[PDB]
Design a protein around this ligand. Structure first.
Ligand SMILES: Nc1ncnc2c1ncn2[C@@H]1O[C@H](COS(N)(=O)=O)[C@@H](O)[C@H]1O
Ligand SMILES: Nc1ncnc2c1ncn2[C@@H]1O[C@H](COS(N)(=O)=O)[C@@H](O)[C@H]1O
Ligand SMILES: [Mg+2]
Lengths: 326, 326
């Protein structure tokens, strides 16, 4: 069964790697804040040897990112690994990873969006539980951050079940470019789209990214899972639909226990009607409960949750999402 | 080998269907144009009962689309089926299609883009050969069609080999909105990115669409195939890359014979340099011919080619892409 890596504790070292886009797209100023932020939380922050390498795709070579990953896992002082930022190409690295090395060195790996690929592949090949959550760059956000740290802390510094609470406010701002002028919005809350109750193994993160593992070794079976699914502003409802239909045609999809969907960005123009239409036409979702408007995805603020950890959904309760194993 | 549907004779009936987006996204006069065009080419044009149904996704219900599809294969006056246009959701239809009925009513199905899903699936399930080529709506283009009819005719009215020939000019115009103010461009032609000779089965069409069948029983094995791939302006170099990585990780990708890539649209901003870097990082393409800039995809003009047919690629000839079986 699944390996829960040791929770972080004060003084632990945290390694920053860039398996997707280069730390070079972050301004010197942003780096400083995130460093200090995690340092104030009580951690030695260190950086992979190649984080700053940059090519024409704003990323770096396969061999470089692979090495930073292996070093990070092989270094025993490192208790958690944080990705710099997402991007597009972490799926390139999958064939080249020493999964024996990784399973021999269980520890936290956390990041989201493109990192879904890497994180999911490591769970499926290794059974190490990984995390969909804050990037390193996530901690460079001056306003609204409290929720991020609280969920990051609930998930990674403590071990008891916790609830994926609804934020009080949420936003959809390009905050790295403008940090003072933000637009927090009262969170109208989660939205029950299909009622029910269930319990299961957590799979998901970024939908179009998880699609990429379909037909590979690295794809997890979906039997007995709660799906936590999200996508960014590039997806429109029609692309979300086709990408979801694809996911729900994969092995184990007949036996999905439920789904939680993260808040969409504004440009996606997802509406309640469209989302309802999309879900209502999916066969594998017919009986199980489904929620939308959760605090993970590309809006602020994000939670941090385990891929390969367990959850319970109860639509009648106030706190609808409970994380149990994590 | 596969089955080849009867080539289109003269006066033969053509049924138009809308398995993706509805015909309601076409202006009345744009349809009048395509109808006259295909009539002049000497065919009886008819429309499925449901082609004008229209939902909030600019498409139509599953069961409507599936009915027009079945009524069209089963009607024996009908010798070719053309899709109105592409979009997003032809992959929804796949579990509901009567493949046995299709298998015993062999005939031409042609269209491209989203239709890649429908066409490929029909092929993998019935091994009836289908076509990536003109939509009904493709025949409403006033300027620059001559190439399109010619390729259409090469593929579907004649039985002998032919070359997927370089066009003299090409464009990337919103021509349905401005039929007169076009912007033709002299075609620098096919780039040989990797030289070679190779022969195999043609698989491909729209890349992110073909991705959607991955991990399903509708996915073709890729052993002994020539991949003809293509994507539209919504893809950027990084997304073309991750989608390509994902395809070249599928069953059979270790035994691909060669690859042809269709001309990118301009908003994609694919540079010869980026494309080369993307290709050289792909393991499955190490020792095989790869050609770029071909005449298919989302620029005009478009060629029509068979899915499940056969092609020879010869970097030494001046006719470098040959379509043998169709
Ligand atoms: N320097 C930067 N450049 C671009 N985006 C930056 C950024 N810093 C923070 N974000 C943020 O990171 C998110 C993108 O996440 S992802 N898909 O994992 O890469 C966006 O919400 C940006 O606002
Ligand atoms: N009425 C219309 N509305 C939108 N696009 C139209 C169009 N007529 C032609 N195209 C065109 O046909 C292509 C779309 O094919 S596809 N991806 O398979 O749906 C694009 O190049 C459009 O410009
Ligand atoms: Mg995809």
């Amino acid at each position: 069964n699944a390996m829960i890596p040791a929770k972080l504790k004060q003084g632990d070292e945290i390694r920053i790697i860039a398996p997707s886009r280069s730390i070079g797209i972050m301004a010197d100023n942003q780096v400083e804040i995130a460093v200090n932020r995690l340092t104030d939380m009580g951690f030695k922050v260190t950086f992979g040897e190649h984080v700053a390498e940059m090519d024409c795709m704003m990323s770096s070579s396969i061999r470089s990112r692979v090495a930073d990953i292996h070093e990070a896992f092989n270094d025993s002082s490192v208790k958690a690994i944080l990705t710099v930022i997402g991007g597009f190409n972490s799926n390139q690295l999958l064939p080249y990873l020493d999964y024996d090395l990784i399973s021999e060195n269980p520890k936290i790996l956390c990041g989201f969006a493109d990192i879904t690929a890497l994180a999911t592949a490591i769970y499926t090949q290794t059974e190490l539980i990984t995390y969909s959550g804050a990037h390193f760059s996530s901690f460079s956000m001056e306003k609204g951050l409290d929720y991020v740290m609280e969920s990051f802390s609930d998930c990674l510094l403590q071990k008891e079940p916790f609830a994926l609470k609804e934020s009080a406010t949420w936003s959809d701002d390009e905050w790295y470019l403008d940090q003072e002028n933000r637009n927090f919005i009262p969170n109208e809350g989660l939205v029950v789209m299909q009622p029910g109750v269930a319990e299961g193994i957590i799979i998901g993160g970024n939908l179009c990214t998880l699609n990429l593992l379909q037909g590979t070794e690295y794809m997890p079976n979906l039997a007995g899972t709660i799906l936590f699914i999200e996508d960014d502003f590039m997806t429109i409802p029609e692309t979300f639909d086709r990408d979801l239909e694809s996911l729900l045609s994969q092995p184990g999809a007949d036996e999905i226990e439920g789904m939680v969907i993260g808040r969409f960005q504004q440009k996606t123009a997802m509406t309640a009607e469209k989302l309802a239409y999309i879900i209502e036409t999916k066969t594998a979702l017919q009986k199980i409960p489904v929620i939308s408007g959760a605090d993970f995805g590309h809006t602020q603020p994000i939670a941090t949750f385990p891929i390969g950890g367990t959850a319970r959904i109860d639509t009648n309760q106030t706190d609808k999402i409970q994380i149990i194993r994590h």
